[PDB]
Amino acid sequence: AIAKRLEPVGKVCVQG
Amino acid sequence: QLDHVDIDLTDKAAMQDGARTFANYCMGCHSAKFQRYERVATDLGIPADLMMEKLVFTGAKIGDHMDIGMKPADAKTWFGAAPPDLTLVARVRGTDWLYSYLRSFYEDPKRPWGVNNVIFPNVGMPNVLAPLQGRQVIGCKQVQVVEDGKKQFDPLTGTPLTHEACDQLTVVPKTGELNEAQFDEKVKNLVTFLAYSANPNKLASERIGTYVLLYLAFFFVFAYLLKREYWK
Amino acid sequence: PQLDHVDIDLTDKAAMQDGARTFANYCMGCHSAKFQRYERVATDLGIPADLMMEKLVFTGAKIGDHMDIGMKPADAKTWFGAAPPDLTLVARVRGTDWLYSYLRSFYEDPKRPWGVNNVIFPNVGMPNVLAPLQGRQVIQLTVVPKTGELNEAQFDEKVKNLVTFLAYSANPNKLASERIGTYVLLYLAFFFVFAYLLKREYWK
Amino acid sequence: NDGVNAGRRRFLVAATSVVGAAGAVGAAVPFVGSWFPSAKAKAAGAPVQVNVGKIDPGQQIIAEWRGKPVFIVHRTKEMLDALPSLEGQLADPDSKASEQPEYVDPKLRSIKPELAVIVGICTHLGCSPTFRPEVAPADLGPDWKGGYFCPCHGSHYDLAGRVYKGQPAPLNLPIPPYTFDADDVITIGVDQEK
Amino acid sequence: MNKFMAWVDARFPATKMWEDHLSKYYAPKNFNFWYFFGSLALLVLVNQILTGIWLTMSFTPSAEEAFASVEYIMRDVDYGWIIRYMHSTGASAFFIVVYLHMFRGLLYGSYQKPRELVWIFGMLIYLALMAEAFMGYLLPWGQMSYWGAQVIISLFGAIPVVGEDLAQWIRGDFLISGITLNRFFALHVIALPIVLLGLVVLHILALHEVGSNNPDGVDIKKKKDENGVPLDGIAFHPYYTVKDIVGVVVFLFIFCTVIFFFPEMGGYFLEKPNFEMANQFKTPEHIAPVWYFTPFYAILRAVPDKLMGVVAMGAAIAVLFVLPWLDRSPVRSIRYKGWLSKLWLVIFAVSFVILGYYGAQAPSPLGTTLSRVCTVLYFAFFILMPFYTRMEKTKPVPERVTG
Amino acid sequence: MNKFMAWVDARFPATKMWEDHLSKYYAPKNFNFWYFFGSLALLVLVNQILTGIWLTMSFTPSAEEAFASVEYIMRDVDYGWIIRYMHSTGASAFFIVVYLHMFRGLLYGSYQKPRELVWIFGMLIYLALMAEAFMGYLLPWGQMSYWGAQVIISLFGAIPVVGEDLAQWIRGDFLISGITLNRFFALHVIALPIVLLGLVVLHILALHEVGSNNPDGVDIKKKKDENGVPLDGIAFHPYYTVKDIVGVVVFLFIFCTVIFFFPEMGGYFLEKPNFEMANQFKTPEHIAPVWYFTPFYAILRAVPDKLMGVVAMGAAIAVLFVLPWLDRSPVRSIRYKGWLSKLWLVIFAVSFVILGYYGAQAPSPLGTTLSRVCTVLYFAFFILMPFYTRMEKTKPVPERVTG
């Protein structure tokens, strides 16, 4: 619950 | 004219969302250097590992201050004004001022960063929450009709009775991730976290003060009896 | 160890200027003198401010700045195994005789990390940075002939001037201290005469 | 005043005094509590990785671990043979009363004999002792065989960090929890695997 | 123990001092609310000394770390925020208690003969307190700290000839900087505390030499019983010690309420702009003094001329020194002074409050007009005292205190 | 002025205090060299307070800037080097003068009845001075400073149970750090100076209550003239005021000679390794205390057990407290005590000096043996006093002071 609340805004799409 | 916000410092979820917003959208330019990640995690109820993984982006330790890489002199050169440390900004400006300021950015081509602020005219801060709020402009929109404080709501639906006004902050539709209520809640959580950061001892202060005042009332009873008696 | 005595003259402006030159060129690479300012060194050594900036300020600092260096203590401690201490007060920490014997006691010691050891400071982490001037000194210490710019007397004079500058840096107030103390003691003797006469008069 | 009620006066004085003393203790709580280690102090420290392959025989290096100096000494053979000869002059030759990892040798107080990692803080009043690997210094006496000499009050330790008998130091120099990440690299702060 | 006290008394006048100053020291029995404030001033001074000593354990008097050190106290030091709020609230409460103390002196003519030296020592205490609070307010090194110090020391630049040199010498630098911070810290932490303690000692000694006034202005020493004790006199210990204990508990209730619930006190005990770090290049939109300096500020702001404004501000405090010789009333207490004295005391209190209220805000037309009027009235309360204390008709002072 | 003093005296105890303490206060007329040191201790305390106040204006009590701020005082502050040397040489002179004062007390039995409280307040002053000097010596944050602080704070670690927790609580950190430096700065600059001022006031008040001893140990109060003035008594003002002025001038001559020509005094007033910045990882090869702490350090070094050594130092200081009850001699002065008392006072002086001398250098075999012997002799001087002050035969004390 806290982890979802604290998710960083920037999402990076990575190879594999 | 500021907008009132009811900030609940006992709301851990709201403070957590505000801390996330501060760490992502604000710590790019603003430090919270008088405040440690460890204390923020302890007070917000965030596990230390979770705080490390989710809110500490600068490689600092858990016990380190919320410092950022942007130096005040560099940022003053770049923006025309140094982004102040935001640990105590809630105390410096108040929570209502912050709530109104973070929601009062509107497009202004005459300005260096293309935006101005109703609360802080000619502020040097770029509108960094534009992706969330969306494009906000000084235009015409529906505002509740008021006549000498005679505020009209709809008796049946309970919604305001509105008339058009052309000097109002209006968000261009489908321009931001969050609607007005969602951005209001985002800004409320951010200002709640800033209010906590400015005064992290508030809740403990109230508890300790309650106990101190109870003790002092007890001691006053005894001292008053020892005085009125012995004055006979 | 046994030290060599050196008579340090803090009134010799030329000697202190030569020592400041040697310190700026050969010693400020690793050592700071961060507790003294270029401006005060220039004033006390009789060096014009423009001349001081041109000849002794290599870091780009202002005349009024502390004689700081780029080599940070942590990096230097990692690199050499020991941090080169700030040398502003070294003449008070060690004394001028110890410095004079130490800077002349470097000899070649292949077993050491930097190929040198010191009689005064065994297993010291300093590289022999004055080897170009003194030459190759080997073990009793003897300098290999035709290995340095300076002979024994010239290198001794160089080290003496450097140690004199270090002694001034440790105690920049010594000359003014003596000058002021002379007058203070004269006034105190003058006042003692009057106080003693007053006491003698009252105690009759 | 007409017939002061004693006992009532005594009781009120005593009760007010006791309540005021409780309040004084409470008001002292901030001042006494502020002297405990603060958040600045509690920053703690992380394990330090030290390359020990470059230590020359009979030499030691200082490693900064948690604000303390750690003597990492590459022990030559001769001093290793001398160490058992000193058991008669050591308060705790077997390290029964000292602080050291369970996995280090009780006598050598190290994972491997040729290297000794010792928390370089004297066990009496806490300073780093001076490393004196020489055999028979004039000041340290002829019975000396190398070790550590505390410069405050002359506590003597052998090269294993074990204190001599009847020194101000009552305990052997602590051995930090360390491992050998490689044959020439150690880490101070993490225990070695069982 | 009896034997222990006998041993001590042969070697130290402990019992003699106790019976000369607290027990067997007969103060008027008609002290009222207004006589709680000397003991409360002592309590606040002790609070300031203790909490300041503890703040000094963590404070850094450098321009680079002063503000950061204050935040370190507020957040990192265990209960350090409590100590800091005790100190700030205690400075504000020191000035509250001292102003009520001085107003008691005004109300009952307690500055008059024989208490002229008591009043002068009290005014020296007030000067020391103002210097101490001003130098303390610089220590946080916030915006208000820095800029208030800048303006207050630029005032010393108003002296016609030596003004600029004197201001530079006071600052220790060409502007307010960390040098000024460290200097004011040293003065605030040792020198002025020592001066204040000595002045408080002298003040209490002078009072005990001449004895306390009372709300009725009755010289209780005139009427004494067969034992020599004044008829209207009661031993300070235990009666007034227990009364002052009750007063101290009430004061502590208010003090702790402020500390733990409203430490900023609406931005007056801890000013909001002072929570921003000092910026030598950006000055606050409106810079104002701490509330307890606001009245004199208003006076200084009421005078269009700069040098005359500084002179008037200084005289506003200096006239209280000569107050004992300005009052020509045959009676001490306002209860028995003529209507003119009561009216002028009301006018002085109202003018002081209005000056403080309008010196706490940015200049305004009505604010400026009222500040000038109140400056005139504040100075007239003293200047006209030697006249209206004689023109008025005073009531006969009772032989025995009322109650 | 006569009129001004008449005005003051009706409102202040000015003339009465002057005539009770300085004028009309009849001290023995046979004070010798050994009676200069109370006034000199007062002067050195004033010098320490003033110079320390001025140093605090430029000192930065942080581990990052303490040493740098000291050098800033030495080099950038105009005459700051003078003030710093006055302060350090004044600490050394404070201990010189205080030791000679205590030795006067030993010589002439000034601790004996009725001056037991005078002696106890003097010992409290000495404890406060030891603590003050130690915390001040930590402030420069040199190698000597850091490692002396480490050792002395770890002394509290010797307590079997609460020792480590107490040492950590005193440090404010898990090791000596800027927290310890700042805390000791606060204690050194305000708390202990205030305590010392109070203790000096109590000390002098007790002395004036019981009266001053003299070298002959003659109670001059027994013989008085018709006016009540002791036959061997002279008003302290002006005779001893002028004598103390002469003593002050001689002390100032020596003090300024040291300041301006030998401020280090061969490294015994300003220690050489303290000119190096504090290093947590490098303990100086010669880590020895300041000279005036060497005698006790030696004692602690003499004891081969940690806790026993700590207790031995503590008792070496504490035995002087009970000294007034250890001396059972029928006479005060050493001039009229038996050969045993003179021999044991010589033994105590020699033992103290030898402990200080060997406590000032690294451990040695002869040094260790002499330190142990002198520790035994130092403690025997006190433990055996109740016996050898009775075994010895004392000369009769004259009815009048000799001279």
Ligand SMILES: COC1=C(OC)C(=O)C(C/C=C(\C)CC/C=C(\C)CC/C=C(\C)CC/C=C(\C)CC/C=C(\C)CC/C=C(\C)CC/C=C(/C)CC/C=C(\C)CC/C=C(\C)CCC=C(C)C)=C(C)C1=O
């Ligand atoms: C917006 O803005 C504004 C506000 O703000 C926001 C305001 O608030 C206000 C309103 C302001 C107020 C009302 C606030 C008022 C506040 C204040 C009053 C603050 C003022 C504080 C200062 C500026 C500090 C100024 C300090 C000064 C000028 C005094 C300086 C004193 C010294 C430096 C002391 C000098 C040191 C000395 C003398 C050394 C000691 C000498 C010795 C000789 C020592 C002894 C030595 C020996 C014994 C050796 C010699 C031996 C002798 C004598 C021989 C014989 C031996 C014997 C001993 C007998 C305004 C107007 C404002 O618009």
Ligand SMILES: COC1=C(OC)C(=O)C(C/C=C(\C)CC/C=C(\C)CC/C=C(\C)CC/C=C(\C)CC/C=C(\C)CC/C=C(\C)CC/C=C(/C)CC/C=C(\C)CC/C=C(\C)CCC=C(C)C)=C(C)C1=O
């Ligand atoms: C080589 O190396 C070596 C050297 O080195 C180089 C050495 O030199 C030495 C040699 C060593 C020496 C000889 C040196 C010796 C030096 C020393 C002894 C120095 C030791 C100094 C220290 C370590 C400091 C220790 C300090 C301690 C333990 C004491 C701590 C005290 C405090 C923190 C104070 C406590 C705080 C309190 C209680 C606050 C006050 C509380 C209150 C209640 C205040 C009042 C509050 C109110 C009024 C509110 C409540 C209201 C009430 C009461 C209600 C009623 C109302 C009324 C007011 C009446 C050796 C051996 C060595 O080998």
Ligand SMILES: COC[C@@H](CCO[C@H]1CC[C@@]2(C)C(=CC[C@H]3[C@@H]4C[C@@H]5O[C@]6(CC[C@@H](C)CO6)[C@@H](C)[C@@H]5[C@@]4(C)CC[C@@H]32)C1)CO[C@@H]1O[C@H](CO)[C@@H](O[C@H]2O[C@H](CO)[C@@H](O)[C@H](O)[C@H]2O)[C@H](O)[C@H]1O
């Ligand atoms: C173990 O004794 C130490 C000395 C003799 C020791 O003389 C003693 C001389 C007296 C004195 C100062 C001593 C203790 C307590 C002291 C008292 C406490 C009380 O306090 C007070 C105040 C408090 C009150 C409560 C009570 O009263 C007093 C009035 C009392 C008091 C202060 C008075 C005086 C006492 C030591 C013998 O030393 C040997 O020699 C070596 C020592 O290190 C050891 O050798 C080993 O370690 C070496 C390393 O150097 C190697 O060389 C070797 O190879 C290796 O074998 C060996 O183990 C050891 O025995």
Ligand code: HEC
């Ligand atoms: C979360 C998105 C943020 C919040 C909440 C705040 N900031 Fe900023 N900001 C920036 C600059 C260059 C300034 C100075 C502008 C000027 O002085 O004219 C500011 C200012 C503020 C303020 C005003 C504080 C005050 O006391 O006046 C507040 C309350 C504030 N900011 C909150 C720049 C930036 C920036 C760089 C792109 C970022 C990412 C943010 N600000 C983010 C936030």
Ligand code: HEC
């Ligand atoms: C880097 C190549 C250096 C230059 C150039 C100079 N010094 Fe140095 N010095 C260096 C180190 C790494 C050390 C520490 C050695 C150790 O084992 O601790 C030193 C030390 C000194 C000292 C000793 C000071 C003390 O121990 O208190 C002195 C007196 C000294 N250095 C002087 C000195 C002079 C005069 C130099 C120019 C001729 C000079 N150093 C250059 C590294 C380097």
Ligand code: HEM
């Ligand atoms: C009459 C006595 C005193 C008064 C009126 C007083 C007043 C003040 C004030 C108003 C401040 C500003 C606080 C703020 O707004 O943050 C302050 C700060 C400070 N004071 Fe004092 N003070 C007094 C005595 C002392 C003493 C005796 C000491 C130390 C011995 C001290 C140490 C400090 C310190 C370290 C600060 C900076 C920390 C802080 O601002 O809280 N004070 N003082």
Ligand code: HEM
């Ligand atoms: C700031 C610290 C001060 C302290 C600790 C202090 C202390 C005291 C105390 C304990 C008393 C006796 C009890 C009482 O009358 O309340 C007293 C009386 C008095 N004080 Fe203060 N005082 C201070 C400041 C002042 C000031 C600033 C003034 C005036 C400018 C002043 C003027 C007087 C007078 C005139 C009296 C005696 C009046 C009477 O007897 O009614 N004092 N003081």
Ligand code: HEM
């Ligand atoms: C450190 C600051 C001290 C100050 C300022 C001070 C002050 C004085 C003064 C002015 C006198 C009278 C004049 C004189 O005897 O020279 C005196 C006497 C005395 N002092 Fe102190 N003293 C201090 C420390 C001590 C200490 C540490 C002791 C003993 C442990 C002590 C014990 C005595 C005794 C016993 C007398 C009476 C001497 C006699 O009557 O013959 N004092 N003191």
Ligand code: HEM
């Ligand atoms: C009996 C009174 C005092 C004694 C015996 C004493 C002793 C000392 C000593 C020995 C030092 C070390 C100086 C050095 O080695 O460089 C020192 C440092 C210092 N003292 Fe004190 N002191 C006293 C009172 C004070 C007071 C009242 C203050 C402030 C008001 C003060 C401020 C300082 C400062 C700032 C330092 C660090 C700067 C320096 O080392 O020169 N001292 N003190």
Ligand code: FES
């Ligand atoms: S400090 Fe190590 S033996 Fe005392």
